[PDB]
C-alpha cells in the first residue's frame, strides 16, 4: 500500500518562508531517491528538485529558477521528505507533488526488501504566493438582447483568495452551463465567468439564477439574470 | 556537462478512439544513456508513470503503449486508444539533466464545429463600481485554435483582455472560449462601437458581434 501524503501548503506573502512536508508510507523510504516537481496553474509539469538515498550519497540537484532559494532534505527516523521554500516570488504559486520518480522505479530494476515496488505520486499541496487579502467577490450579469438560442452569464469579479462555486438555480440547472476557469488579473484578484445556452422561448416562462459561494470570504450570492430592459 | 533543454513535438494531436497516437520528444543534446521518461496526466490527478529508460514500459501499462528513440530523439506510441487515454503526456529526461518537456495534449476528434459568438456589454452596476468589462462568448466549437480580436472604435485592443476555455465537453466533446476586455469607466464612455470579431476555421469569414454603447 504505497501513499506519499503532502502538507504544509499555504498562502504565503511574497518574500516568506514555507515548509513543505511529505510523509511515506508502504514502501521502504530510505533506500528511495525523492523528487519535489511543481505545477503552476494551466501549466506544464516543473521538476524543483530531488535527493537521492543514503547509500547514494544524499546528495540534492535543484532546477534553476529555485536553486540558491529551495532546500530539499529528508528525515529517514520518520520517513518524511521536506522542501524548505525561502524568498518566495509569485510565480512559485503551485501544486507541488513528491514522488519516488523514475530515477527510484528505473535503478529499482522495474519492481521489488518486503516484495515489489511500484511508481508513487502524492495527491499534491497548493503554495500560494501572493500578497493579496481576502475579499469577496462582486457579481455582475451577461444579459442577452435573439434567435433561437440565447446565451446568459455571471461574471464573478476581484475575489482572493480560491475558489468559487457557482451552480444555477439552486443546482438544479446543469444542461448547457460553462463555468470558466479563473484568471489572476495584474491586481492580484481573480475572476470567473459562468454561461449557460438555453431556448429564447423560454426566457418569460423560466427564471435563471446564478448561486456564487466564495467561502474564504464567507459570501454567498444569488443573481438574477435576464434580459436587459431595453427601458 | 551542460544543462539540456527540451522539445516536445508537437503541441496538440487530434486523434479518434481505436487510432495510433504517435508523440516526439527531442532534446538539445544527447540524453545520457537514454535515461528518458514518459508520464500520464489526466486533469485533477497527479502523473502515471508510463515509459523508462527510452523503451521499458512499467508495471500495469497496458500493452498498447510503447517507447523508442535514443541520443536526441524519442518516440512514445499507442497502438489502439481506449476512451480513458485522452490526456496530457510529458516526457522527462533524468541523465544529466532533469527537465520535463512542455506537454502535448491528446483530445478526442469530432466533425468541424463553428463557435456561436455573443457579445454582452458592462452592466450598470459594474460602471457604478469604476471599472467596464466587456465579455465575448465562443460557444460549442472545434477544433481549438480560436482568434478573438477586440475593436473599440475600429482600434485593434492589445493586452487588456483575457481569456478562458472549458476542456472538451464530455457529451459533445466540443470548446467553449470566454475573452473579457476590461476598460477604466472613463475610458469606455469615450467610445461608442465595441465588436469582438473571431476568426476560426468553420467560418467562411471571420464574424463579428457588436454594440453600440448605451443602445
Known amino acids: 500500500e504505497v501513499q506519499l501524503v503532502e502538507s504544509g501548503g499555504g498562502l504565503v506573502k511574497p518574500g516568506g518562508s514555507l515548509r513543505l512536508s511529505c510523509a511515506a508510507s508502504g514502501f521502504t523510504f530510505s533506500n528511495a531517491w525523492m523528487s519535489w516537481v511543481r505545477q503552476a496553474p494551466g501549466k506544464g509539469l516543473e521538476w524543483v528538485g530531488r535527493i537521492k538515498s543514503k547509500t547514494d550519497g544524499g546528495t540534492t540537484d535543484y532546477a534553476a529558477p529555485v536553486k540558491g532559494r529551495f532546500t530539499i532534505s529528508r528525515d529517514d527516523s520518520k520517513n518524511t521528505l521536506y522542501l524548505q521554500m525561502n524568498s518566495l516570488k509569485t510565480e512559485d504559486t503551485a501544486v507541488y507533488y513528491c514522488?519516488?520518480?523514475?530515477?527510484?522505479?528505473?535503478?529499482?530494476?522495474?519492481?521489488?526488501?518486503?516484495?515489489?515496488?511500484?511508481?508513487?505520486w502524492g495527491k499534491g499541496t497548493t503554495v500560494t504566493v501572493s500578497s493579496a487579502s481576502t475579499k469577496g467577490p462582486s457579481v455582475f450579469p451577461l444579459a442577452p438582447s435573439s434567435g433561437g438560442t440565447a446565451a446568459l452569464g455571471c461574471l464573478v469579479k476581484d475575489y482572493f483568495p480560491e475558489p468559487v462555486t457557482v451552480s444555477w438555480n439552486s443546482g438544479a440547472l446543469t444542461s448547457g452551463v460553462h463555468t470558466f476557469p479563473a484568471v489572476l488579473q495584474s491586481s492580484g484578484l481573480y475572476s470567473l465567468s459562468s454561461v449557460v445556452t438555453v431556448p429564447s422561448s423560454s426566457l418569460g416562462t423560466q427564471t435563471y439564477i446564478c448561486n456564487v459561494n466564495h467561502k474564504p470570504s464567507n459570501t454567498k450570492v444569488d443573481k438574477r439574470v435576464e434580459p436587459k430592459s431595453c427601458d | 556537462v551542460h544543462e539540456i533543454v527540451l522539445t516536445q513535438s508537437p503541441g496538440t494531436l487530434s486523434l479518434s478512439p481505436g487510432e495510433r497516437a504517435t508523440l516526439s520528444c527531442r532534446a538539445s543534446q544527447s540524453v545520457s544513456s537514454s535515461y528518458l521518461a514518459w508520464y500520464q496526466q489526466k486533469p485533477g490527478q497527479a502523473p502515471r508513470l508510463l515509459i523508462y529508460?527510452?523503451?521499458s514500459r512499467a508495471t500495469g501499462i497496458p500493452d498498447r503503449f510503447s517507447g523508442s528513440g535514443s541520443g536526441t530523439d524519442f518516440t512514445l506510441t499507442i497502438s489502439r486508444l481506449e476512451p480513458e487515454d485522452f490526456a496530457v503526456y510529458y516526457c522527462?529526461?533524468?541523465?544529466?539533466?532533469?527537465?520535463f518537456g512542455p506537454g502535448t495534449k491528446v483530445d478526442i476528434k469530432r466533425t468541424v464545429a463553428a463557435p456561436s459568438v455573443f457579445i454582452f456589454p458592462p452592466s450598470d452596476e459594474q460602471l457604478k463600481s469604476g471599472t467596464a468589462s466587456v465579455v465575448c462568448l465562443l460557444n460549442n466549437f472545434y477544433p481549438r485554435e480560436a482568434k478573438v480580436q477586440w475593436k473599440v472604435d475600429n482600434a485593434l485592443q492589445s493586452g487588456n483582455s483575457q481569456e478562458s476555455v472549458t476542456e472538451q465537453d464530455s457529451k459533445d466533446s466540443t470548446y467553449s472560449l470566454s475573452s473579457t476586455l476590461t476598460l477604466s469607466k472613463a475610458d469606455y464612455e469615450k467610445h461608442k462601437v465595441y465588436a469582438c470579431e473571431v476568426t476560426h476555421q468553420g467560418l467562411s469569414s471571420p464574424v463579428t458581434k457588436s454594440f453600440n454603447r448605451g443602445e
Open positions: 522527462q529526461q533524468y541523465g544529466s539533466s532533469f527537465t
Open positions: 514522488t519516488t520518480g523514475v530515477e527510484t522505479y528505473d535503478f529499482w530494476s522495474g519492481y521489488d526488501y518486503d516484495y515489489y515496488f511500484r511508481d508513487v
Open positions: 529508460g527510452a523503451s
